[PDB]
């Protein structure tokens, strides 16, 4: 199916406590594969998936050199933004950057992204055409001007449409065991009396990959959206995900309810019932 590669960068200023904290992480789909932490001893880009451990020193030295440059950029950016927004030197502020590329089921380039946020809100983003910029406010219009004159979008377009997707395809092949896999949800249901006249039915999806899943309850075939407790999909720690959906049912009505599970790893959508 479809795939993506994404890098995420966070820098947080630490006035009086040294240089800003910088953390970079890279993903292919829902699988992390590299990290850099400014506060760690190694000062190197590091593997976080087994398939990337096979890349040689030339890859790791190159990623380390580039990630330090991303770090430097954010150090400059924090000072710039502080200036643009007339903020004091005392406060901690956050710059975030994300970029990457999507390929479709044919593995061909589908979409590219490159976006920046300051203190949790949009600052500037490359439009989907990869040729123009969305400036969130008046300060960002200044960055937009600078970047338009320096033809920054042209350089990003060439990466997002080219090397981004070439590397994504390389990773897909080298990590085929990890990345071209699906883990279908293992499902179960639990029943727990919450009083003499009500019971909780909890429908579970465990050990699935990728994270995308749809879990719903029906009563007599009618969707129970506004009556269903749904937790956010959550990582298990081992590369798989979990989720559950619960309904409180009047004792005696258990048979009216069905849980429906949709996931790429299933041969067909599941319908589960308590007896």
């Amino acid at each position: 199916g479809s795939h993506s590669m994404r890098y995420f960068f966070t820098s947080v200023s630490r006035p009086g406590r040294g240089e800003p904290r910088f953390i970079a992480v890279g993903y292919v789909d829902d699988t992390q594969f590299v990290r850099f932490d400014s506060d760690a001893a190694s000062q190197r880009m590091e593997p976080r998936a087994p398939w990337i451990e096979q890349e040689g020193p030339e890859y790791w030295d190159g990623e380390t050199r580039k990630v330090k440059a991303h770090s430097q950029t954010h150090r400059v950016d924090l000072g710039t933004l502080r200036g643009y927004y007339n903020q004091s030197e005392a406060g901690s502020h956050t710059v975030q950057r994300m970029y990457g590329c999507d390929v479709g089921s044919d593995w061909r380039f589908l979409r590219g992204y490159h976006q920046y946020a300051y203190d949790g809100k949009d600052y500037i983003a490359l439009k989907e055409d990869l040729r123009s910029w969305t400036a969130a406010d008046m300060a960002a219009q200044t960055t937009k001007h600078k970047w338009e004159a320096a033809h920054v979008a042209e350089q990003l377009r060439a990466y997002l449409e080219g090397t981004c997707v070439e590397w994504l395809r390389r990773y897909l092949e080298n990590g085929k065991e990890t990345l071209q896999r699906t883990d279908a949800p293992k499902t179960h249901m639990t029943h727990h009396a919450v009083s003499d006249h009500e019971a909780t039915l909890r429908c579970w999806a465990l050990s699935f990959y990728p994270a995308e899943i749809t879990l719903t309850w029906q009563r007599d075939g009618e969707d129970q959206t506004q009556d269903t407790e749904l937790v956010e999909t959550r990582p298990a720690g081992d590369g798989t995900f979990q989720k559950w959906a619960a309904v409180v049912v009047p004792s005696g009505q258990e048979q009216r309810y069905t849980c429906h599970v949709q996931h790429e790893g299933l041969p067909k959508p599941l319908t589960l019932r308590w007896e």
Binding site: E63, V76, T163
Partner: peptide
Amino acid sequence: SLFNTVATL
């Protein structure tokens, strides 16, 4: 593989 980043805000 990372972009060869150059621009600052």
